[PDB]
Amino acid sequence: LDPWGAVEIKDYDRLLRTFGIRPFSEVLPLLRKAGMEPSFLMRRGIIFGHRDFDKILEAKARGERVAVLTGFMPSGKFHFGHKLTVDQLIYLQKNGFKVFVAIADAEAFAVRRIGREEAVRIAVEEYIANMIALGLDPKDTEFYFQTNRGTPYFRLIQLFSGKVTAAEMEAIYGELTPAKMMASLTQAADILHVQLDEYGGYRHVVVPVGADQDPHLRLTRDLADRMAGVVELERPASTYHKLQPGLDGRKMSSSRPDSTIFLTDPPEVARNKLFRALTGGRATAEEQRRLGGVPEVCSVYHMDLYHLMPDDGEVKHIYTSCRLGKILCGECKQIAWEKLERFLAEHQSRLEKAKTIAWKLVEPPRF
Template sequence: MSAKLDPWGHYAIEDYRKLLEEFGISPIDKILGLLPHKHKYFERLVIFGHRDFDIWLEALKRGEKVAVLTGFMPSGRPHLGTAMVYEELKFLQSLGAHVKIAIADAEAYIVRREDRSEVIRRGVEFVAHSIAWGINPDNAEFYYQTAMDNEYYRLIQLFSRKITTAEMEAIYGDINPGKIMAALTQSADILHLQLDKYGGYKYIVVPVGADQDPHLRLTRDIADRFEQELGLKRPSSIYHKLLRGLDGNKMSKSRPEYAIHLDDDPETAEKKLANALTGGRATAEEQRRLGGEPWKCSIFELYVYHLIDDEKELKERYDECVNGKILCGQCKRIAAEKLRKLLIEHQKRFKEVITSGIAEKILKKPSF
């Protein structure tokens, strides 16, 4: 495991325990009792770590204003990894939190060098998919970074004054002007909500994949440095494990053949599953004798993250695998059927959201 996490990289993180130690992320299992109600991601430790999420939960309990901020870089089509963040937002919203979502068009333009008009078009789709997944638009705001106003951009200028290149290198490793700009813009995304103009929320939580922790470390440092001047407070964060692609690497929008996209037709998705990396043995005889290795299996990961809600059913699937009672071909067919159902239902809702025009209406377009 490298000493640096790369939020713009494409690798999967193997050892989450090491991540907790190395970067000082707190384990989530110690604070599960503070959650007002359960969610499978917490129960299964898919969300494995946090920074100050207990402080956020206590503020929620006291009835103080709490908010959630996250961002999506629309550099491809949303996939089941993106849907993990939708799922977390839906859960946090169900606790009563206000949700704000940045469409990171500036970052897609700067870091991924994407065509801006295409990015703007995709932003609407990301919003429509989030609503189709279950995010309530009545308690959510969505914005393009480049549609924000002067106060937000003023924050980026102010932040740049108190951050050195050496600090950026220590956090991100390889850095260039574009990445510095993108990182400070993300800090403005997270912290602008604390300004009175944007609601004055002091307790912000950011749900992200583990690879995004560098942005949180930077933003927390910045908040400390601007506490006196701007009244900023450190944001909290929760970290989920990355859903691996079907080849075992990080599921990425830029490697579509190894990701299940939310707009994949069920037949395409089924073909992708058929070629997925599993924890199966070399031969059927060996698998019956030794059992499979679900902890290495991208299909089992789909069960855990998206396809099986019921704990008993998940345990049965696990036991059948490790006891060699099921072979991967059959197991993939079960997963494909569940996935087909999920995609058909989601796509039906997506179509309704698009037809209603709500995503277009609530996402203010940049003026230039």
């Protein structure tokens, strides 16, 4: 009975310590003092790492307003990969964090070749509207476009350009276009700019990411340090989540629709995707009942663990049964489906109103 899977953690949690990334449990006593109980993603070890989130919670504890920031590429549809990020935002927002969400429409245009009108449409109706329907507060959340964020944010990007080398950027990105160079600096500015007085002066900011995104964060932290004497910036903190494996064994992508469920999928499309998902199940009903299934490798069990079963007892019960022989994939799938069906229907019923609201939460760029 290891339902949370500490085993696969410990392995790289050794190597990430090299980058100053720590086990998330080291912040529990601070979470408590900050008046916060861990979210289920934290209890389950899905949020496994942090860097400097202690410093964030210390500020918060003494009454400082703290912030969380992330951004989204407005391309393709909003999926459960995206949902995992937003749920961390919602948890922090309910605990008093100021939330910033950047729309990466400059990067969309310049790196991904996405048209202006479409980037803006997708951002508002597919990203912001889904985040609102998920529960991000339309009034206190500050959404913005990279291309419409104002002089002091843009100044950072200009000044950061003097404080990084081609080689440092080549390390992070590989072979490096002007667009990618520009994207990299703008993203550091997305993270750091909220510390400027013109955007609220939030010195203490945490960014929720996957380990695979740390190199850009370390660059952003170096930029903050290298700006000493020009503008005073604190190194941003972070939390680290394991990435949810896709329904087809590979990473969730709008690119391959069967990898993931889109939050706008009609019930029949979603069910079919779910019933097609890879499992840790066996050759036949019969072999399953003798040995059991393998949840550690099962994408249905991961849907349960990351989204569909917030109750620890329910998901443990699924883990145990699967292993103990007591359950077949077909039934397991139908159980996850019924959680999914209800979440989708409540979600989609909020979505048309969220779209109306979304267009009023931002000023889209003129061109």
